[PDB]
Amino acid sequence: GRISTGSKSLDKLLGGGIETQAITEVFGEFGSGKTQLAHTLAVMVQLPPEEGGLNGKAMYIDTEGTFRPERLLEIAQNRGLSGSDVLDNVAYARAFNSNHQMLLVQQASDMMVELLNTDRPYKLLIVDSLTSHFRSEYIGRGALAERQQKLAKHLADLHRLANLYDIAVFVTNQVQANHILAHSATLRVYLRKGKGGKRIARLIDAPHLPEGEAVFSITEKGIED
Ligand SMILES: COc1ccc([C@H](C)NC(=O)[C@@H]2CCCN2C(=O)CNC(=O)c2ccc3ccccc3n2)cc1
């Protein structure tokens, strides 16, 4: 049981879609479609398995004010769904610094246990974006050891949530050409801009999946082939 991205091409690259019990990271420049894929996943996860979802709820942690509840409505309506119910099934939190971002993962644990054995459990946790607060707050050579200690602890908490509660953790990371915030991820996907409103996804760290690329479009339905 995997969460469809909305793109048949990007799902085949991922072996069916985004996995639970894993952290799936997309990285790329600004504008490559990371936040759009996250918004689509927040909707897709609500669908029944036959339509590409997991009959679940989504949690969205927003570190840069990128969350657009209207965009969720747009995606839901164009896919034949109630924009109201789609919004009812997404838990949302704005993280204003890296300490708040870390506490939210701890608090997400409480929300997940509660729904764990119900009809619509949480199935997706989004962190958009994972690193930005760490880059901006840990300033100077004197702060780099603590920066990695906190980033490492934060990824350990996310891995633990994913395994405990059988949820997909989807994180976005803004890697620019051209400063390195190393961190663990189960799956890494590089996004870049393509021909017009197309985007290209490349598998970077994928243990046994065949390497390769996939093309997808940003449409009114979220992400599409
Ligand atoms: C009509 O316009 C809208 C605008 C936005 C929405 C969004 C989608 N819904 C919400 O904001 C809903 C409804 C009001 C409170 N609320 C929450 O989700 C409150 N969330 C939390 O307390 C919380 C706590 C810890 C978390 C840790 C990780 C991730 C998420 C977390 N969320 C709905 C309608």
Numbering used by the authors: 111 to 288, 303 to 349
Give verbatim lines from the article:
BRCA2 acts during HDR to control the recombination enzyme, RAD51, a eukaryal protein evolutionarily conserved as RecA in eubacteria, and RADA in archaea. RAD51 executes the DNA strand exchange reactions that lead to HDR by assembling, in a sequential and highly regulated manner, as helical nucleoprotein filaments on single-stranded (ss) or double-stranded (ds) DNA substrates. Structure-based approaches to identify modulators of the BRCA2–RAD51 interaction have been impeded by the lack of a monomeric unliganded form of HsRAD51. We have previously described the development of molecular surrogate systems for RAD51 based on an archaeal ortholog, RadA from Pyrococcus furiosus (Moschetti et al., 2016). In brief, we were able to produce the C-terminal ATPase domain of RadA as a stable monomeric protein, and by careful mutagenesis, to convert the surface of the protein to resemble human RAD51, with the ability to bind the BRCA2 BRC4 repeat with high affinity.
We replaced the naphthyl ring with a quinoline, converted the Ala residue into a Gly, and introduced a 4-methoxy substituent on the right-hand phenyl ring, leading to 6. Compound 6 has a clogP of 2.76 and an improved FP Kd of 8.0 μM (n = 22) against ChimRAD51. Two independent X-ray structures of 6 demonstrated that this compound was still bound to the FxxA site with the quinoline accessing the Phe pocket in a similar orientation to the naphthyl in compound 4 albeit with a shifted binding mode discussed in more detail below.
